[PDB]
Amino acid sequence: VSFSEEQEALVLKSWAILKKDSANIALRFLLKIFEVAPSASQMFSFLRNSDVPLEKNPKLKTHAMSVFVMTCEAAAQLRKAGKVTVRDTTLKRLGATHLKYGVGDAHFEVVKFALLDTIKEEVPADMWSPAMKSAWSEAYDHLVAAIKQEMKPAE
Amino acid sequence: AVAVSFSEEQEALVLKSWAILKKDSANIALRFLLKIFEVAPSASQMFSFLRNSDVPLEKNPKLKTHAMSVFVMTCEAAAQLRKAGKVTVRDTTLKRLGATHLKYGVGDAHFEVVKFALLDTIKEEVPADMWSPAMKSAWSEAYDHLVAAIKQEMKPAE
Ligand code: HEM
Ligand code: HEM
Numbered sequence: 319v320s321f322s323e324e325q326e327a328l329v330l331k332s333w334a335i336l337k338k339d340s341a342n343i344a345l346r347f348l349l350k351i352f353e354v355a356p357s358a359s360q361m362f363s364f365l366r367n368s369d370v371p372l373e374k375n376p377k378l379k380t381h382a383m384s385v386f387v388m389t390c391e392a393a394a395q396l397r398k399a400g401k402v403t404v405r406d407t408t409l410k411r412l413g414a415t416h417l418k419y420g421v422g423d424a425h426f427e428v429v430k431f432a433l434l435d436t437i438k439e440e441v442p443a444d445m446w447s448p449a450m451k452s453a454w455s456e457a458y459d460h461l462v463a464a465i466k467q468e469m470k471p472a473e
Numbered sequence: 474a475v476a477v478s479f480s481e482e483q484e485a486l487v488l489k490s491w492a493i494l495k496k497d498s499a500n501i502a503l504r505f506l507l508k509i510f511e512v513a514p515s516a517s518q519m520f521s522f523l524r525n526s527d528v529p530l531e532k533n534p535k536l537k538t539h540a541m542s543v544f545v546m547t548c549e550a551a552a553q554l555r556k557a558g559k560v561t562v563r564d565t566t567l568k569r570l571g572a573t574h575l576k577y578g579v580g581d582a583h584f585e586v587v588k589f590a591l592l593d594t595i596k597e598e599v600p601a602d603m604w605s606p607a608m609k610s611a612w613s614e615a616y617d618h619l620v621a622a623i624k625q626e627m628k629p630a631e
Contacts, residue, residue: 353589354512354585354586354589355581355582355585355586355589356585357580357581357582357585358582422515422580422582423513423515424513424515424516424580424582424583424586425582427512427513427514427515428512428513428582428586431511431512431513
């Protein structure tokens with residue numbers, strides 16, 4: 319896996335834009351998943367805030383952030399070491415949770431799709447490219463693959 | 474029972490939009506197929522590899538035939554909900570659909586992704602003057618009900 323500094327930079331600087339506006343963007347991201355695959359949003363709770371009808375669960379925002387943060391971290395690792403180097407304790411845990419809630423390939427792929435959609439939508443038209451798309455995809459795909467190694471018996 | 478409300482208007486919306494797709498069928502099918510692969514590569518990959526050994530998504534007859542089915546059967550479900558008040562897929566045909574999809578690991582997310590792609594195709598291919606939220610909802614209702622029937626034969630009658 320050759321993951322260049324340029325590719326990493328595409329991920330970092332695009333993320334820096336989503337971070338500046340993380341509350342509004344997280345909600346658009348969540349509602350995108352709900353649009354594509356309502357059953358994914360079902361794996362969590364329903365509804366809870368300050369007497370609000372919106373889709374504002376705390377755990378949904380936190381999870382959204384985790385996906386983006388860890389994928390970004392994963393970009394960093396591919397550059398530095400050419401592989402995902404997340405703590406083996408963290409990987410076992412991620413493994414166990416996702417298998418417990420019955421997350422399959424379809425779910426990981428829906429989230430990938432909504433993640434890329436969100437980035438394209440939120441960053442300026444001239445920052446976006448197939449190169450940006452592939453930089454994020456590669457990182458995500460490598461992170462998902464490592465989690466899945468811990469979702470099945472000793473290879 | 475589940476309260477059916479499928480109208481003549483809804484059926485008409487499905488049918489005339491269906492007529493539009495058939496003027497550019499091969500190309501529309503291919504775009505629908507690339508939508509699925511874009512959202513859920515795995516969904517697409519269930520349609521095999523060795524027996525034909527045809528690499529490309531673009532070449533797979535199973536894929537083209539399957540797309541045709543999703544659309545055609547959904548149209549019929551429109552017509553059936555309107556006339557009969559329910560999906561009237563003959564029962565051997567229905568048991569066979571439930572078997573085949575259970576056999577290939579098809580779950581709720583898969584059914585939703587296909588709906589997502591079907592609605593995309595509908596919005597992308599029909600003229601902006603023609604398209605409306607009502608048109609989207611008519612397709613969704615017909616599709617949802619067809620899926621509800623197939624799923625009944627994918628779980629214990631229990
Ligand atoms: C790269 C992708 C993803 C990352 C990095 C990620 C990360 C996480 C993390 C850090 C947690 C906290 C749970 C724990 O570790 O104790 C979590 C929980 C969870 N994740 Fe993911 N996740 C990913 C994809 C998905 C997908 C695709 C789904 C479902 C469509 C999903 C469903 C869940 C569920 C249901 C929980 C449990 C949350 C709860 O207890 O309410 N995750 N995920
Ligand atoms: C309203 C929705 C759908 C309809 C009407 C439909 C209809 C069909 C039909 C008629 C067959 C013919 C095989 C047989 O049973 O003899 C079939 C096969 C199959 N379908 Fe579906 N399907 C639907 C949704 C899905 C979804 C969501 C998936 C997966 C993402 C899927 C995956 C398959 C697979 C893998 C086969 C077997 C391949 C083959 O033998 O050709 N289908 N479907």
